[PDB]
Amino acid sequence: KVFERCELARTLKRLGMDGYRGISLANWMCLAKWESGYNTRATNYNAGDRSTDYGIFQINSRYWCNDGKTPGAVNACHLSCSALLQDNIADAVACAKRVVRDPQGIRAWVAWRNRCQNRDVRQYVQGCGV
């Protein structure tokens, strides 16, 4: 599904993302916006290294989920990558939280560095009741 902005903001807040490991809701919204346009069903193949990015946060199969076809990959979220293509984002949120328990935190996604870091991200949550 493609979430509407404020519905996603409230969905993420009910899932415990506001301030998780120091990360505001607006930062998670900016991440989802630029990774996927708030789209849970998206996959993007990376031909350079044979990995694939999955779902609303475009989480990569080399370290985070298992798709069976990424050579030498691991599965730190202990999920099939299929779980990251559901309309229900609970599993994707659990995996995003796993990502940010590692040292880089939200910097693990380069799109966040490019499109969210050191920026005014307040617009993403404006009016949403979060």
PDB file of C-alpha atoms in Angstrom, residues 2 7 9 11 13 15 26 32 34 38 55 65-66 75 87 99 107 112 118:
ATOM      1  CA  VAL A   2       0.934   3.651  -0.401  1.00  0.00           C
ATOM      2  CA  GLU A   7      -1.792   8.125   8.520  1.00  0.00           C
ATOM      3  CA  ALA A   9       2.954   9.242  11.019  1.00  0.00           C
ATOM      4  CA  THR A  11       0.983   4.366  12.415  1.00  0.00           C
ATOM      5  CA  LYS A  13       3.929   6.490  16.529  1.00  0.00           C
ATOM      6  CA  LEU A  15       4.516   1.250  16.765  1.00  0.00           C
ATOM      7  CA  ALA A  26       9.865  13.390  11.514  1.00  0.00           C
ATOM      8  CA  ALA A  32      10.136   6.619   4.292  1.00  0.00           C
ATOM      9  CA  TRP A  34      12.623   9.459   0.192  1.00  0.00           C
ATOM     10  CA  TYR A  38       5.569   5.717   1.618  1.00  0.00           C
ATOM     11  CA  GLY A  55       9.507  -2.051   1.294  1.00  0.00           C
ATOM     12  CA  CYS A  65      16.574  -9.785   5.728  1.00  0.00           C
ATOM     13  CA  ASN A  66      16.849 -13.100   3.882  1.00  0.00           C
ATOM     14  CA  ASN A  75      19.755 -11.718   8.054  1.00  0.00           C
ATOM     15  CA  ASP A  87       0.783  -3.607   4.056  1.00  0.00           C
ATOM     16  CA  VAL A  99      19.085  -1.366  11.991  1.00  0.00           C
ATOM     17  CA  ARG A 107      22.802   7.058   9.012  1.00  0.00           C
ATOM     18  CA  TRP A 112      18.596   9.861   4.983  1.00  0.00           C
ATOM     19  CA  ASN A 118      20.916  18.556   8.824  1.00  0.00           C
TER      20      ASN A 118
END
